[PDB]
């Protein structure tokens, strides 16, 4: 019985690969070979946000693209006003080890999590005037590596226990558990329509998940190592992943295959953070070799470099309006680029 | 600038002061990463993620044990890694050696020293005195090995030599393993950790000052 099931699975995988190849007549490089090139882009450090005394791990922009949040190993979740570089809030954390943070779309809540296997959600808008903990989501049996807010009472968390979870902040229980990964889920990226999301795992696999149905729909492979960062395309019909194999990959939900590979023979270091511009023409690949790179999403060529970090770059985000880019790092300094 | 955008700066300065105070408080505590394996005795070395704090000689040490390819990079800045090993058995000893080799050659742990803790040496002594289980069966080089009961000392020295030989491979001197022997009823482990941490910090300062 087991042999028959294994043979059936192998045949299904072979047929899926054959179908994918049958849908691959041209290449994105050939399609955009006649497009106007981006050229030379030189973004400069407009702001430097000092104040962290440990390595920064996560950073999430606000919807208004003025506030932002960052988490550091010193037990500090700092909410900054990026315009004037004023620390709006500084939240002590129960666990000093935090690997993820999120900012609610309404701006009323923030989220954090890490090696404590607890997703702490803090309510910013309170009568008491201080940032208290609104909820402590528990149930994961591994460290949380990424979390994203859907609404004020719905958050998707990815943990190291090979499972993602759509929660219910009002009741604090997992409304849906997304299973199917064989390794730690490093990152998750919600889609603009908020009906689907993606999750990259250590098995070099990016799985698309339907929030409403609560079941995986598509699986993308093609990476040689762990997938550290993943980000949805602004259109919602594509996404990009960064992996430890020093390559970035572009996948299409409809095409269900790898379109473009952004990599260079010179670079040998893994990607830790990936984010998209508002128009999608620029892919911001954050590396751990102390600098970030800008890739032409349609030419698969490097557009510019963002250097100025003395340590590993951990988190990278783009403002919702596309005004600026925040890049955190392990040297406790997160910079803003424009 | 107006009052609204200046009281904000005053609040930012207050937050900066609090952050500096907290960081100065945190810099005075040494963070230890407690590693090991199941049934290795890591539970009783010193009398989600689990954290413990103990003070000796007015110095506070924090030991964190999690229960490792990915999250280990979160402990890139720990002062030392307390690697506990149960030497009583021999079948799993090679597994412990492989774990130690993986930890030593980790990309994010190339500048951290390891306070190796060969735990449950009393059971090793009992096993080698009984003679029912022979190390030579598991390690063929043990028969050709001799010390630099005397058999217990030879076995202990062999285990330490194997661990140190694993450590010295491509070490480059940036970090050095510090072997130790600890029994179940031992109570001097805190002092050993204290001395090892003192040596680690002294070596780090000497490296910083461009000396040896």
């Amino acid at each position, epitope marked *: 019985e087991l042999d028959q099931l294994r043979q059936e699975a192998e045949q299904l995988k072979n047929q899926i690969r054959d179908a994918r190849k049958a849908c691959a007549d041209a290449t994105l490089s050939q399609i955009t070979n006649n497009i106007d090139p981006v050229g030379r882009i030189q973004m400069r450090t407009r702001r430097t946000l000092r104040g962290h005394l440990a390595k920064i791990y996560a950073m999430h922009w606000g919807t208004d693209s003025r506030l932002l949040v960052s988490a550091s190993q010193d037990g500090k979740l700092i909410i900054w006003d990026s315009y004037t570089t004023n620390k709006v809030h500084a939240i002590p954390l129960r666990s000093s080890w935090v690997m993820t943070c999120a900012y609610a779309p309404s*701006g009323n809540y923030v989220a954090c999590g890490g090696l404590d296997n607890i997703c702490s959600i803090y309510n910013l808008k309170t009568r008491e005037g201080n940032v208290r903990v609104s909820r402590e989501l528990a149930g994961h049996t591994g460290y949380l590596s990424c979390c994203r807010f859907l609404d004020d009472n719905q958050i998707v968390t990815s943990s190291g226990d090979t499972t993602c979870a759509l929660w219910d902040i009002e009741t604090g229980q997992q409304t849906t558990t997304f299973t199917g990964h064989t390794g730690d889920v490093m990152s998750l990226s919600l889609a603009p329509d908020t009906r689907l999301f993606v999750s990259g795992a250590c098995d070099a696999s990016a799985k698309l998940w339907d929030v409403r149905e609560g079941m995986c729909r598509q699986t993308f492979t093609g990476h040689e190592s762990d997938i550290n960062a993943i980000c949805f395309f602004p259109n919602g019909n594509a996404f990009a992943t960064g992996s430890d194999d020093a390559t970035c990959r572009l996948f299409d939900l409809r095409a269900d295959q790898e379109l473009m590979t952004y990599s260079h023979d010179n670079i040998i270091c893994g990607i830790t953070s990936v984010s998209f511009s508002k128009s999608g023409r620029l892919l911001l690949a954050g590396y751990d070799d102390f600098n970030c790179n800008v890739w032409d999403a349609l030419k698969a060529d490097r557009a510019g470099v963002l250097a100025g970090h003395d340590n590993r770059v951990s988190c990278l985000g783009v403002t919702d309006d596309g005004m600026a880019v925040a890049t955190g790092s392990w040297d406790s300094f997160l910079k803003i680029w424009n | 600038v107006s009052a609204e955008d200046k009281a904000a700066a*005053e*609040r930012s300065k207050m937050i900066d002061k609090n952050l500096r105070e907290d960081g100065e408080k945190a810099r005075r505590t040494l963070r230890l990463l407690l590693l090991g394996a199941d049934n290795s005795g890591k539970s009783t070395i010193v009398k989600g993620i689990f954290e413990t704090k103990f003070q000796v000689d007015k110095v506070n040490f924090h030991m964190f044990d999690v229960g490792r390819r990915k999250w280990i990079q979160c402990f890139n800045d720990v002062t030392a890694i307390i690697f506990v090993v149960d030497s009583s058995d021999y079948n799993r000893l090679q597994e412990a050696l492989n774990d130690f080799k993986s930890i030593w050659n980790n990309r994010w742990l190339r500048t951290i020293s390891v306070i190796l803790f060969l735990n449950k040496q009393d059971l090793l002594a009992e096993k080698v005195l009984a003679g029912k289980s022979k190390i030579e069966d598991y390690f063929p080089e043990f028969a050709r090995y001799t010390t630099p009961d005397p058999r217990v000392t030879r076995a202990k020295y062999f285990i330490r030599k194997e661990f140190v030989d694993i450590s010295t491979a491509s070490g480059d001197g940036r970090h050095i393993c510090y072997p130790h022997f600890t029994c179940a009823v031992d109570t001097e482990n805190a002092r050993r950790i204290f001395n090892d941490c003192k040596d680690i910090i002294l070596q780090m300062n000497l490296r910083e000052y461009n000396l040896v």
Partner: single-chain antibody
Amino acid sequence: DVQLVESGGGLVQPGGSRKLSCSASGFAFSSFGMHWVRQAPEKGLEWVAYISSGSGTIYYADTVKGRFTISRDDPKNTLFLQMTSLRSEDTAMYYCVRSIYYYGSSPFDFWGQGTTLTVSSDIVMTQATSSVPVTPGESVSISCRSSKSLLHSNGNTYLYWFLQRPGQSPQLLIYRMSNLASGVPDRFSGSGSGTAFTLTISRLEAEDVGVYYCMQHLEYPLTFGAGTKLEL
């Protein structure tokens, strides 16, 4: 939850001394800027003093500068106003007002109780209307004018609207001329440009009758307008 109580007041002979206390409970008093704002028995509200978080910045009104001292005890969660040489024009009802300042904050959100005290250039805000008789359910408007433009170079127009019901302490309605304070019904709205602002309410309900004050916060002092009045 949030509650500020006041102690002191009473009768003071002219030129005397008095210590007014404001005890906070239910919120982080250390991180909230505090103000003392006085209201005359038959006039508008007058700003008296302001102290920042941690006592790092203190401002006084020109009327009471040099004669009034403001202080705060964070461990005891107390706000102190020491008044010396009380003139006959300093008799008023004093309110200690919380106000926190960060991007998106709502200053003057919660006003404490009142303490009566009976003694035996500046941007001036104009409230042309003195009393507007209105009927419930009818949308009305209140007009306010400023001597100088309140629109700042950052796009933030520091105008605040406060409501005082008969026998009740003031509360914040609209802060920064466009945003609505929390807990206030969505009927209220604010609009206008520099030196010309309008607070428009739709479907006026019961208990909405009272005094309305337009305050500027561009710089100091904090000059309240004369304030209009809505009555049945």
